[PDB]
Design an enzyme around this catalytic site. Structure first.
Site, PDB file in Angstrom:
ATOM      1  N   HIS A  15       0.829  -1.205   0.000  1.00 46.53           N
ATOM      2  CA  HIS A  15       0.000   0.000   0.000  1.00 46.53           C
ATOM      3  C   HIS A  15       0.860   1.250   0.000  1.00 46.53           C
ATOM      4  O   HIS A  15       0.699   2.117  -0.858  1.00 46.53           O
ATOM      5  CB  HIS A  15      -0.925   0.009   1.223  1.00 46.53           C
ATOM      6  CG  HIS A  15      -1.922   1.122   1.227  1.00 46.53           C
ATOM      7  ND1 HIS A  15      -3.218   0.966   0.779  1.00 46.53           N
ATOM      8  CD2 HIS A  15      -1.820   2.408   1.633  1.00 46.53           C
ATOM      9  CE1 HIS A  15      -3.872   2.106   0.908  1.00 46.53           C
ATOM     10  NE2 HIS A  15      -3.044   2.999   1.421  1.00 46.53           N
ATOM     11  N   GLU A  16       1.784   1.325   0.958  1.00 49.39           N
ATOM     12  CA  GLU A  16       2.632   2.495   1.128  1.00 49.39           C
ATOM     13  C   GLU A  16       3.570   2.671  -0.052  1.00 49.39           C
ATOM     14  O   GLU A  16       3.877   3.784  -0.434  1.00 49.39           O
ATOM     15  CB  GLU A  16       3.428   2.417   2.442  1.00 49.39           C
ATOM     16  CG  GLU A  16       2.594   2.363   3.707  1.00 49.39           C
ATOM     17  CD  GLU A  16       1.466   3.372   3.726  1.00 49.39           C
ATOM     18  OE1 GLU A  16       1.699   4.546   3.405  1.00 49.39           O
ATOM     19  OE2 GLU A  16       0.332   2.994   4.060  1.00 49.39           O
TER      20      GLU A  16
HETATM   21  N1  LIG Z   1      -2.294   7.244   3.972  1.00 43.27           N
HETATM   22  C1  LIG Z   1      -2.224   6.445   5.233  1.00 43.27           C
HETATM   23  C2  LIG Z   1      -3.056   7.084   6.347  1.00 43.27           C
HETATM   24  C3  LIG Z   1      -2.494   8.390   6.876  1.00 43.27           C
HETATM   25  C4  LIG Z   1      -3.470   9.114   7.787  1.00 43.27           C
HETATM   26  O1  LIG Z   1      -4.686   8.961   7.613  1.00 43.27           O
HETATM   27  O2  LIG Z   1      -3.023   9.848   8.683  1.00 43.27           O
HETATM   28  C5  LIG Z   1      -2.663   4.998   5.043  1.00 43.27           C
HETATM   29  O3  LIG Z   1      -3.820   4.712   4.745  1.00 43.27           O
HETATM   30  O4  LIG Z   1      -1.866   4.077   5.204  1.00 43.27           O
HETATM   31 ZN   LIG Z   2      -2.960   5.245   1.700  1.00 39.74          ZN
END
Ligand SMILES: N[C@@H](CCC(=O)O)C(=O)O
Ligand SMILES: [Zn+2]
Ligand SMILES: *[C@@H]1O[C@H](CO)[C@@H](O[C@@H]2O[C@H](CO)[C@@H](O[C@@H]3O[C@H](CO)[C@@H](O)[C@H](O)[C@H]3NC(C)=O)[C@H](O)[C@H]2NC(C)=O)[C@H](O)[C@H]1NC(C)=O
Ligand SMILES: *[C@@H]1O[C@H](CO)[C@@H](O[C@@H]2O[C@H](CO)[C@@H](O[C@@H]3O[C@H](CO)[C@@H](O)[C@H](O)[C@H]3NC(C)=O)[C@H](O)[C@H]2NC(C)=O)[C@H](O)[C@H]1NC(C)=O
Ligand SMILES: *[C@@H]1O[C@H](CO)[C@@H](O[C@@H]2O[C@H](CO)[C@@H](O)[C@H](O)[C@H]2NC(C)=O)[C@H](O)[C@H]1NC(C)=O
Ligand SMILES: *[C@@H]1O[C@H](CO)[C@@H](O[C@@H]2O[C@H](CO)[C@@H](O)[C@H](O)[C@H]2NC(C)=O)[C@H](O)[C@H]1NC(C)=O
Ligand SMILES: *[C@@H]1O[C@H](CO)[C@@H](O[C@@H]2O[C@H](CO)[C@@H](O)[C@H](O)[C@H]2NC(C)=O)[C@H](O)[C@H]1NC(C)=O
Ligand SMILES: *[C@@H]1O[C@H](CO)[C@@H](O[C@@H]2O[C@H](CO)[C@@H](O)[C@H](O)[C@H]2NC(C)=O)[C@H](O)[C@H]1NC(C)=O
Ligand SMILES: *[C@@H]1O[C@H](CO)[C@@H](O)[C@H](O)[C@H]1NC(C)=O
Ligand SMILES: *[C@@H]1O[C@H](CO)[C@@H](O)[C@H](O)[C@H]1NC(C)=O
Ligand SMILES: [Ca+2]
EC number: 3.4.11.7
Length: 875
Positions: free
Chosen positions: A318-319
């Site tokens: 994902h990241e």
């Molecule tokens: N983009 C991040 C979440 C970051 C956030 O909401 O603070 C994720 O879903 O892994």
């Molecule tokens: Zn994300």
């Protein structure tokens, strides 16, 4: 003190959004933490492109204070006279009125704004903060930042909007015992004192503020090298170093897979991952320095479950997606957040599927995103994928099922419709077009429309500019018509107003006798279409690939039930999951008689596959929870469903054997047997639990959670509760800790659960990141349902002070009320909400849980007798 708050509204700083005429270019950012003091200071110099005459310059800042009069500079280099500075709280701005005004940014010269600031490292998981951990008995410190969506402005003054991309050269002054990390590699390290070091990083590519990240740490590291020749490293506590191995593997594999798949080089010279000991979300894709919660990064094959393995792999993947979708190309505004999150949620499956071959990941999309979010998006209080957001609270609220799961789901439908090859090449073109800039949803349709010349915009707008989805109503096996699917049959289907009027362009696929066909079902075909030989049965929406439900004629549904009883294998595992899921959702919506739905469960003694069992367990969990206190219906639902899982539960046994999916199946199937009150399954749980209490036996990893839960529930007492609490403190593995917390939440004892709730206020015992997880675990306890609910009410002011109303997880905690199903409980909810009407990021969650509870009340009224009859007659 220096920049006092003013309620002066006569200025463009009264506007929620930043002005068009100011674009930063480069940030010179320096910070110096006093770790032991929980404070930091810094200075930031920002090069600014000005496009219109203004006597004021403003940007985002929250909580952190300006310490010295800001300093402005002409594009020629002369120092600009500054009259005042002031804070404007309502829109989170700090403003400086200059004497002059002048408007130049005509050449290559830019204005230069320099600011001195001071902030706190305590009391928070956002901005720049410090947290501790224990190593060889010593308390150690680590500091890091977390910004998405609107918290970079707490770390340092900045233009805190995703489309104000600027370049970054960051430096940190830290004690020499510490290393310093950021987005970019280390450029140079110079000694300030014999005690302090200044670590300067190399210039970044242009990037969004929410992606800026730095950390001060004493972590060890595990290293790998990409095909690119670039260092991919995971930073990890020495104690936990061995648990970084798997994440390192997947980072390599998925990094290499994506770079090729997107036909684009990762934009930076290195990539780092690090889990902060206390971390406010799952993970954050900060360019080059991806931060994690330990449960999503650190995995021990000797102690962690297959479920944990998959979670690690998926979050890592994902990241990584974000390094392209989100980082290289960013959405122009938060309304298009799905361009980040939906893409990551989609491609994460492709990444992990490459890394782990026999995980059936593509199918698992149905279980992870598609079917769960079809539930969410059948409420009136859902929202369209492209979402109007006008406050920081609204912005953070949309990090939800719609952006992630429905985003993922409509891309999955889009890919299939447009063909994988063309979806791939289309994503690539989009990626090269908007690199280091921002895109809107329209920009993505156009890109793909070049890869297919199919009507992408026209079709995909219907799925994107309005909430909800259709049910396909089948007439005469072959004619289909569309209608909006809402769980509440009383709800007005035309609301809230949609320009598209809740009709969709549906890419429709069906299987005629092992041969598949395709049609675009057009909005303008108001009276439905006819599916184009000599047919007795049409399989509409194979693998549930389209984001819609199919309501067959009752005769067909009846024939499906019988076909399953005779040979369920005539349908694929996904098709079975899908038919079962639709049927029970249709019954829930009063669109199909429950007897017809329940008839589909009759074959189950012979069901052996993961997907259908998962969606059956989901359907029954709801129904069983609605009848929890119905001593007439409950034992009957229990007896029957216990009977249906018993063969598969027995067949798989209480032992870790088989491949990934089998092991996942066993967990949920044994869990469901326990839940249904199977004496032999509960006895296995209690026996293993009793053995674990003897302090030696290491439980099979995929059985642990079940044993802690049902073991504690059926034979737990103060002695074993205390023991389990000690074990939770003593283990370093976050994944184990989390299971033990679920165990602790499972005890059938009010006194012990009260002690547990009190521990939430003790930061030495429960981490700040884990408080809502624990509250939710307790709410699942047949006593804790009301205990957790009462506790969040009694302690609401405390939680708001601790977390702020901008905290998403706090906003969502009211969803522990989801199983409520009486007028009395609804009145309790409304009474609590009326007392604390400032909901912040909880505004949507409140709306959703109210709609859910009202549906429950109605559901019970409508269906108790029918469901009772079906069970009584069968039994
Ligand atoms: N983009 C991040 C979440 C970051 C956030 O909401 O603070 C994720 O879903 O892994
Ligand atoms: Zn994300
Ligand atoms: C963990 O769960 C197991 C089931 O998954 C238990 O093992 C089962 O025990 C049952 C009774 O002890 C057996 O069922 C039947 O026993 C009666 C006794 O009167 C016999 O007539 C029957 O022949 C038998 N049924 C069948 C269909 O053969 C099970 O055979 C047995 N094994 C399985 C695989 O189901 C364990 O007891 C339980 N462990 C603990 C510690 O409680
Ligand atoms: C789809 O669901 C239908 C509605 O429940 C099924 O039809 C029912 O089958 C029941 C058997 O499971 C019948 O119950 C029996 O008959 C009478 C009821 O009045 C009782 O005296 C009997 O004791 C009872 N049998 C047992 C063993 O207890 C129902 O009569 C019958 N209901 C109706 C309204 O017809 C269908 O069978 C089912 N279709 C499938 C599975 O394909
Ligand atoms: C971090 O700690 C400081 C100091 O303990 C906190 O500042 C205090 O804030 C309260 C108001 O709630 C005052 O009563 C104290 O006098 C303050 N002390 C100082 C030295 O300023 C600060 O609030 C904490 N930060 C966070 C984010 O909670
Ligand atoms: C990470 O990847 C390596 C393969 O590059 C895994 O391989 C292990 O080591 C040897 C030799 O490479 C293999 O024969 C074994 O299959 C592996 N197992 C063990 C226990 O050493 C390694 O396991 C992976 N890391 C994990 C799963 O954490
Ligand atoms: C729930 O837990 C409490 C606390 O352990 C139990 O009360 C204890 O009972 C033991 C043994 O009967 C006594 O020695 C202690 O004096 C009690 N402790 C406290 C703090 O009251 C209670 O019996 C349990 N409740 C159940 C099983 O329903
Ligand atoms: C289990 O744990 C608790 C907490 O450590 C034990 O201690 C008592 O806890 C209560 C608060 O819930 C205090 O009021 C008492 O002072 C504590 N007793 C002490 C410190 O001696 C409890 O004794 C433990 N029970 C068992 C059976 O191990
Ligand atoms: C379905 O639609 C076709 C074409 O419009 C029509 O001929 C037929 O009567 C309809 N009904 C059924 C039950 O097939
Ligand atoms: C739906 O109908 C309209 C008619 O104006 C057309 O523009 C659109 O392309 C149609 N979609 C099809 C036939 O796939
Ligand atoms: Ca964040």
């Amino acid at each position: 003190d220096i920049c006092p708050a003013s309620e002066d509204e006569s200025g463009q700083w009264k506007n929620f959004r930043l002005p068009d005429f100011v674009n930063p270019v480069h940030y010179d950012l320096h910070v110096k933490p006093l770790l032991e003091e929980d404070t930091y200071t810094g200075t930031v110099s920002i090069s600014i492109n000005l496009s219109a005459p203004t006597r004021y310059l403003w940007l985002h800042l929250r909580e952190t204070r300006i310490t010295r009069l800001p300093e402005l500079k002409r594009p020629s280099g002369d120092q600009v006279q500054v009259r005042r500075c002031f804070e404007y709280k309502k829109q989170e701005y700090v403003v400086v009125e200059a004497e002059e005004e002048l408007t130049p940014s005509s050449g290559d010269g830019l204005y230069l704004l320099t600011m001195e600031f001071a902030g706190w490292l305590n009391g928070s998981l956002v901005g720049f903060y410090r947290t501790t951990y224990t190593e060889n008995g010593r308390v150690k410190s680590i500091a890091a930042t977390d910004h998405e969506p609107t918290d970079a402005r707490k770390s340092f003054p900045c233009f805190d909007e995703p489309n104000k991309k600027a370049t970054y050269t960051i430096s940190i002054t830290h004690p020499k015992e510490y290393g310093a990390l950021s987005n970019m590699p280390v450029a140079k390290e110079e000694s300030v004192d014999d005690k302090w070091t200044r670590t300067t990083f190399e210039k970044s590519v242009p990037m969004s503020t929410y992606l800026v990240c730095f950390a001060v740490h004493q972590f060890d590291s595990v290293k790998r090298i990409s095909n690119s020749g670039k260092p991919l490293t995971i930073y990890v506590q020495p104690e936990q170093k061995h648990t970084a191995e798997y994440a390192a593997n997947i980072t390599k594999s998925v990094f290499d897979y994506f770079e090729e798949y997107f036909a684009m080089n990762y934009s930076l010279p290195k990539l780092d991952k690090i889990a902060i000991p206390d971390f406010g979300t799952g993970a954050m894709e900060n360019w080059g320095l991806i931060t994690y919660r330990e449960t999503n990064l650190l995995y021990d094959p000797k102690e962690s479950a297959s479920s944990n393995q998959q979670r690690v792999a998926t979050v890592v993947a994902h990241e990584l997606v974000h390094q392209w979708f989100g980082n290289i190309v960013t959405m122009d505004w938060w309304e298009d957040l799905w361009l980040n999150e939906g893409f990551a949620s989609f491609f994460e499956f492709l990444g992990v599927n490459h890394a782990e071959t026999d995980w059936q990941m593509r199918d698992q999309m149905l279980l992870e995103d598609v079917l769960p979010v079809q539930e969410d998006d059948s409420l009136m209080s859902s929202h369209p994928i492209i979402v109007t957001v006008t406050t920081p609270d609204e912005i953070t609220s949309v990090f939800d099922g719609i952006s992630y799961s429905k985003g993922s789901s409509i891309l999955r439908m889009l890919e299939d419709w447009i063909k994988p090859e063309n979806f791939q090449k289309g994503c690539q073109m989009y990626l090269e077009k908007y690199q280091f800039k921002n895109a809107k949803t329209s920009d993505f349709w156009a890109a793909l429309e070049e890869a297919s010349r199919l009507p992408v915009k026209e079709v995909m707008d219907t799925w994107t500019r309005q909430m909800g989805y259709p049910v396909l109503n089948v007439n005469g096996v072959k004619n289909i018509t569309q209608k909006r699917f809402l769980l509440d049959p009383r709800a007005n289907p035309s609301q809230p107003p949609s320009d598209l009027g809740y009709t969709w362009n549906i890419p429709v696929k069906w299987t005629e006798d092992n041969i598949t066909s395709s049609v675009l079902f057009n909005r303008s075909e108001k009276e439905g279409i006819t599916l184009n030989s000599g047919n007795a049965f049409l399989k509409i929406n194979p693998d549930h690939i389209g984001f819609y439900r199919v309501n067959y004629e009752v005769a067909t549904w009846d024939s499906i039930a019988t076909a399953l009883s005779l040979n369920h294998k005539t349908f694929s595992s996904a098709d079975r999951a899908s038919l079962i899921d639709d049927a029970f959702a249709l019954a829930r919506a009063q669109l199909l008689d429950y007897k017809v739905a329940l008839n589909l469960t009759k074959y189950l003694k012979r069901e052996e596959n993961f997907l259908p069992w998962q969606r059956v367990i989901s359907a029954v969990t709801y129904i069983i929870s609605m009848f929890e206190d119905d001593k007439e219906l409950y034992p009957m639902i229990e007896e029957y469903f216990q009977g249906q899982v018993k063969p598969i539960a027995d067949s798989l046994g209480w032992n870790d054997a088989g491949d990934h999916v089998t092991k996942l199946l066993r967990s949920s199937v044994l869990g469901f047997a326990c839940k249904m009150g199977d004496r032999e399954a509960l006895n296995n749980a209690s026996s293993l639990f009793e053995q674990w209490l003897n302090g030696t036996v290491s439980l099979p990893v995929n059985l642990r959670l079940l044993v802690y839960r049902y073991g504690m529930q059926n034979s737990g007492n103060e002695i074993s509760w205390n023991y389990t609490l000690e074990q939770y403190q003593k283990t370093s593995l976050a994944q184990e800790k989390e299971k033990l917390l679920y165990g602790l939440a499972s005890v059938k004892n009010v006194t012990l659960l009260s002690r547990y709730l009190d521990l939430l206020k003790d930061t030495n015992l429960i981490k700040t990141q884990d408080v809502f997880t624990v509250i939710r675990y307790i709410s699942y306890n047949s006593y804790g349902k009301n205990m957790a609910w009462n506790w969040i009410q009694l302690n609401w002011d405390y939680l708001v002070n601790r977390y702020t109303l901008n905290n998403r997880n706090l906003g969502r905690i009211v969803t522990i009320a989801e199983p409520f199903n009486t007028e009395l409980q609804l009145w309790q909810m409304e009474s609590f909400f009326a007392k604390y009407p400032q909901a912040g990021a909880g505004e949507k969650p409140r709306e959703q849980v109210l709609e859910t509870v009202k549906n429950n009340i109605e559901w019970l009224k409508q269906h108790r007798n029918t469901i009772r009859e079906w069970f009584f007659n069968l039994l």
